[PDB]
Amino acid sequence: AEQSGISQTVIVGPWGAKVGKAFDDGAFTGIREINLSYNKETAIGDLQVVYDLNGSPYVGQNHKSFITGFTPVKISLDFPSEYIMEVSGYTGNVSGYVVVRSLTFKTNKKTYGPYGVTSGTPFNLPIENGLIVGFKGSIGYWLDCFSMYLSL
Amino acid sequence: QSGISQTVIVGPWGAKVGKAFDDGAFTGIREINLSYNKETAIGDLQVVYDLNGSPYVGQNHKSFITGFTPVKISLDFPSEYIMEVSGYTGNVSGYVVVRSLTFKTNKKTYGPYGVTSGTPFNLPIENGLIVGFKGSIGYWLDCFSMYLSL
Amino acid sequence: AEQSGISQTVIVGPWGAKVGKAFDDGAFTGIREINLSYNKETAIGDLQVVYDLNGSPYVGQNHKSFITGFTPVKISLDFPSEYIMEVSGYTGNVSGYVVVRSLTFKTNKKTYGPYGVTSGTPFNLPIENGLIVGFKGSIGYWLDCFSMYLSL
Amino acid sequence: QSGISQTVIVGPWGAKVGKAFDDGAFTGIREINLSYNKETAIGDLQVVYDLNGSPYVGQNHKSFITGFTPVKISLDFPSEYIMEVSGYTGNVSGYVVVRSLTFKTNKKTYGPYGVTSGTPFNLPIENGLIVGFKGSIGYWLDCFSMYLSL
């Protein structure tokens, strides 16, 4: 804006640990589809998002755990009339680490989830005005932490 | 479009049901005045905002009842700003209200003020600023939301 | 955002000179009324704005020329259904200085102006999406330059 | 609201009447490719954007006709960015088109490219960034608008 030539966005989070490999999808114009995986005994083990980028899909990088045995879930949104209004979940200890154990996504049409274990410390982000336009965080054995880009 | 500017708003935390208030959006935050009762919840809320480099005293949002302990949080504006807001919501006398609040800045943690029981919530901010508050207060702070901006 | 506790806004301009006393109203939530003055032989000699601040009026500081003999004009907008869509005007030389000689304001309802002398170099700012929420600039004998804060 | 994010858009400059295009909004600008004819106006426009730290090659928006001179503006991203866009609009063969463009960065001025006659326009930016282009191109660039962001 007055410093560098890189546009800035509001970012909220992280929820989870403060430790595992960092990832950052950056900011887009909306969300078409979310793919994740979970294990009902542990935590979240995958995140991949199909973003909107100015009217067309942009397939985000797959952020995958090192370990196997997760159950995949696909959330296909009726884009653009359907959009996420609230994200909630739980953080908790697994094998000595604080990780994201559960996620739920509430849209204007449906509630998707909870996926994973609803045990530990809850968190929730309701949005009165604005949109989630991006994800970042960290994943090793499980999803350690995550933050969200918010925009008008 | 309408002729009124808009900003990101997150929340509400607390009830999903008091007198509603909406301060709107400002340039920043200079001072927060709140009150709490270590047996019940948060009562009063009043914020001194920044408006383009001058203090702007927000309306006092007061509980209907007395018996609260007042707290003043005077921030070192503009170098000090809130990076995380956390608290607890829970039942008090049949109503779900905001029982506890804590404010973490880049300099210091303020609180918890009130009762730390019920369901926790937290809003950490990686990039951006809280620039306003809205919500509802009856006997206690029933709910609140926050305006966020760059 | 990540540096200080002061919120930032897009600012466009200046139009006019690069020199006279600087003023900066800062950013608000909308515009209710604009007051200006002009002299048909010279340039713009006054600017004062009644802003909206979260649903109520905020009377901006009067930014007045040192000299006398201007014709006042008051633009009372039907706030909030009426808002400015385009600002245009002219910059030009008066008495050896580059100054703002003319202004016109086009809203979704009416065109107000031109006020002043339509002579010199034209400029125009049409807005497809967004709002003018603030003014800054410089005024001495005449309005030397001005910029505008823009917001969603 | 809708599920699509929005940004400030200023413009259009040029005609108020070609094939319309809309690149949308990105993280920043790495490279601009344009073409001009020193007798008529601007023809082609194509932008390499930044998308979250990677180059993103925007669609080539080409004139229907040939005979243009190509120009490449390779910015030193992210330290170099555009601070002002100026140009001229005027009649060419019955159509009001964008005849000239110049780009001023914090490092250098690029242009003018094309014909500097007609009605001037300029957009200087004190705070913020150009993050996208839209408009219409027939024989020439008929009009264009710019996405602005922090």
Please enumerate in sequence order all residues whose Cβ is within 8 A of that of D84, keeping only pairs 6 or more positions apart, or say none: D103, D104, D122, D123, D124, D125
What does chain D come to in residues? Answer: 150
Residues D16, D21, D25, D31, CA torsion sign: negative
Find chains touching chain A: ≥3 CB pairs under 8 Å.
B, C, D
- Write the residue in A2, A31, A82 that is nearest to D127 by C-beta: A2
Would you state the torsion angle of the CA atoms of residues B130, B133, B134, B140, taken in this order, to the nearest 10 degrees?
120
φ, ψ of residue D53 in degrees (nearest 5): 95, 0
Query: Residues of B with CB below 8 A from A151's CB?
Result: 8
What gap in Å lies between CA D134 and CA B33, rounded to an integer?
47
Would you state the torsion angle of the CA atoms of residues D51, D55, D58, D63, taken in this order, to the nearest 10 degrees?
150
Residues B72, B77, B80, B83, CA torsion sign: positive
Instruction: Determine the residue of chain C that is closest to A3 in CA distance.
Output: C3
Separation in Å, CA of B132 to nearest CA in chain C = 10
Please enumerate in sequence order all residues whose Cβ is within 8 A of that of C128, keeping only pairs 6 or more positions apart, or say none: D9, D10, D11, D12, D145
- Write the residue in C2, C7, C28 that is nearest to B127 by C-beta: C2
**C-alpha Rg value of chain C to the nearest Å:** 15
Separation in Å, CA of A69 to nearest CA in chain B = 31
Query: Residues of C with CB below 8 A from A11's CB?
Result: none
- Write the residue in C1, C8, C152 that is nearest to A152 by C-beta: C152
Task: Give the 3-state secondary structure of A39-65.
Answer: CCCCCEEEEEEEEEECCEEEECCCEEC
- Write the residue in D3, D50, D128 that is nearest to A80 by C-beta: D3
Q: What is the CATH number of the domain that holds A52?
A: 2.100.10.30
Identify residues after which chain D is interrupted (C–N over 2.5 A). Answer: 17
Query: Residues of C with CB below 8 A from A1's CB?
Result: 8, 10
Separation in Å, CA of D67 to nearest CA in chain C = 31
Residue burial A34-66, b: 16+ Cβ < 10 Å; e: rest: bbbbbbeebbbbbbbbbbbbbeeebebeebebe
Place of tokens 């073409």: D35
Separation in Å, CA of B13 to nearest CA in chain A = 8
What does chain B come to in residues? Answer: 150
Containing structural domain, residue A55 = 1-152
Beta carbons within 10 angstroms of residue C19's beta carbon: 13
What gap in Å lies between CA D49 and CA D40, rounded to an integer?
27
Cβ contact B77–C29 (<8 Å):
no
Which DSSP category does B103 fall into? E
| C interface residues, B as partner, C-beta within 8 Å | 1-2, 4-8, 24-31, 52-55, 77, 79-83, 129, 131, 133, 151-152
CB B109, CB B115: distance < 8 Å: no
Number of domains in chain C: 1
Place of tokens 């008066």: C94
What gap in Å lies between CA A134 and CA B127, rounded to an integer?
13
Query: Residues of C with CB below 8 A from B4's CB?
Result: 29-30, 52, 80, 131
Residue burial C30-44, b: 16+ Cβ < 10 Å; e: rest: bbbbbbbbbbeebbb
The experimental resolution of this structure, in angstroms, equals 2.0
What gap in Å lies between CA A53 and CA A32, rounded to an integer?
10
Cβ contact C5–B22 (<8 Å):
no
